[PDB]
A paper describes a structure:
UGT74F1 and UGT74F2 are the enzymes responsible for the in vivo glucosylation of SA in A. thaliana. In UGT74F1, glucose is transferred to the hydroxyl of SA, creating a glucoside; in UGT74F2, glucose is transferred to the carboxylate group of SA to create a glucose ester. UGT74F2 exhibits the GT-B fold with ligands bound in the cleft between the two domains –the N-terminal domain is comprised of residues 1–245, while 246–449 make up the C-terminal domain. UDP and SA interact primarily with residues in the C- and N-terminal domain, respectively.
We crystalized UGT74F2T15S and UGT74F2T15A in complex with UDP and SA or UDP and 2-BA. As the findings with both mutants were identical, we will present further the structures of UGT74F2T15S. In contrast, UGT74F2T15A and UGT74F2T15S form both SGE and SAG; UGT74F2T15A has wild-type activity for SGE formation, better than UGT74F2T15S, and both mutants form about 5-fold more SAG than the wild-type. Relative to the wild-type enzyme, mutation of residue 15 to serine or alanine in UGT74F2 did not lessen the specific activity for SGE formation, but did increase the formation of SAG. Altogether, these data suggest that the structure of residue 15 is important for SAG formation in both UGT74F1 and UGT74F2: the smaller the side-chain, the higher SAG formation (with Ala > Ser > Thr). Perhaps the presence of a branched amino acid at residue 15 constrains SA binding in a particular conformation and functions in organizing the binding pocket.
Residue numbers in the entry: 4 to 447
Amino acid sequence: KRGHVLAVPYPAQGHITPFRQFCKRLHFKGLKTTLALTTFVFNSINPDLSGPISIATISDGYDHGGFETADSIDDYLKDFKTSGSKTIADIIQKHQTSDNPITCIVYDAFLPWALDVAREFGLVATPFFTQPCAVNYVYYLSYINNGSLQLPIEELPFLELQDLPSFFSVSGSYPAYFEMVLQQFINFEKADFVLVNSFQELELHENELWSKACPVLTIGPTIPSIYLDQRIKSDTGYDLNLFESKDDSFCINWLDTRPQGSVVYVAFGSMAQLTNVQMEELASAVSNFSFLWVVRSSEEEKLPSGFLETVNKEKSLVLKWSPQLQVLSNKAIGCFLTHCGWNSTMEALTFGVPMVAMPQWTDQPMNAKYIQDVWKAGVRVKTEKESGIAKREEIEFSIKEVMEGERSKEMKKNVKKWRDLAVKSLNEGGSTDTNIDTFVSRVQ
Ligand SMILES: O=c1ccn([C@@H]2O[C@H](COP(=O)(O)OP(=O)(O)O)[C@@H](O)[C@H]2O)c(=O)[nH]1
Ligand SMILES: *[C@@H]1O[C@H](CO)[C@@H](O)[C@H](O[C@@H]2O[C@H](CO)[C@@H](O)[C@H](O)[C@H]2O)[C@H]1O
Ligand SMILES: *[C@@H]1O[C@H](CO)[C@@H](O)[C@H](O)[C@H]1O
Ligand SMILES: O=C(O)c1ccccc1Br
């Protein structure tokens, strides 16, 4: 009971969730954990603190209003390095006289400066990669190549430019975030271990390639235990959400009154923003189906005029935020139109839901390529070359390809083999169970 992990996610939903889920595993194995949330995020969730994973607050420099009050992405990350470094040190020192001093920092790989804080205080330090081995390996190859990538990639020759992370195909876009994903590797060889939210059997080739460069420990998937290994009976869902929902049994009760495989689930995660015009094509494309579609509150104005008032309530429903785990487990879902965020993707693979892949940016085009051409668990929507955006007829056809055809009955078959592979990896003797045990052994 000696060790104590301070877990520091990037302050965004797709990072806090895998970090929190990992702390639940660690707790079940006997490791005390504290999750470090920025003050802005802490005051927006108003989390419940009567649980096994304690909360500390840190600062990113934007306590009052968070990321949106920052002038720019580069200012946000630079200020987060400054205030995050001091406030993480502040937590370490505050715990020094305690019963369990902090002994280890698990920090988002996006934040390599947290390793410097951990090393200053003599702690174990491990970066935690919330994206898959293939993506991280591609970034790693580019980092050692001075931030460039020339195709084809010898060890991954099937990758075309339209499949690389958006930073390589949209020249110059988001330079602060491109620098960030490259600099994940600035010091990661000096950490005690490198953690990845994937499982070895999902990406055998890429895990082994990347491990030659630096030993990594796959410790995923971070989907709650009740849906997979079922060894942690208290781990029943995602219980830190940055978004409010209508306390939705509303959503699951409704899915129950629908025929099996009949509903198209549409969601774009917590971050991705679609333009006026992209929302028009989408709204027209999906209205040919029975659909359950998450349109985040900030995105509603970009819906076509009078759209919310003309959805057939018998066949379709529009939500502000979904209990995505319960939706993807409900058998009313015939397919998942997704932005190919890594959590959504892994969730879809394990619940055996075939995908319509509609990536937008960052690592999402990589996940899309793997969904269609490596795992063969779905089809990618074709976007216009000159205008860049997927038109209504190409989205409707992609959904059809997954819902009905001969292509459809192949992708259902292949997508169901991943659940048991993950259950095996999480059960005793599994790949991921062994790696977690290795980490727990070092920490204490
Ligand atoms: O309406 C929604 C949309 C997303 N999610 C969850 O939010 C996470 C999104 O993470 P991902 O890596 O897919 O995408 P990002 O939001 O980081 O772009 C996932 O755990 C989803 O299950 C949810 O619960 N309800
Ligand atoms: C990275 O930059 C992009 C803008 O290009 C931001 O969307 C993102 O901010 C995230 O936005 C979410 C809400 O849509 C918040 O939940 C999240 O905490 C915040 O980090 C920047 O991270
Ligand atoms: C960065 O760019 C993509 C579209 O190119 C958008 O989906 C994100 O919301 C934005 O941050
Ligand atoms: O790719 C991601 O997960 C991501 C999330 C949040 C901010 C920036 C990025 Br580049």
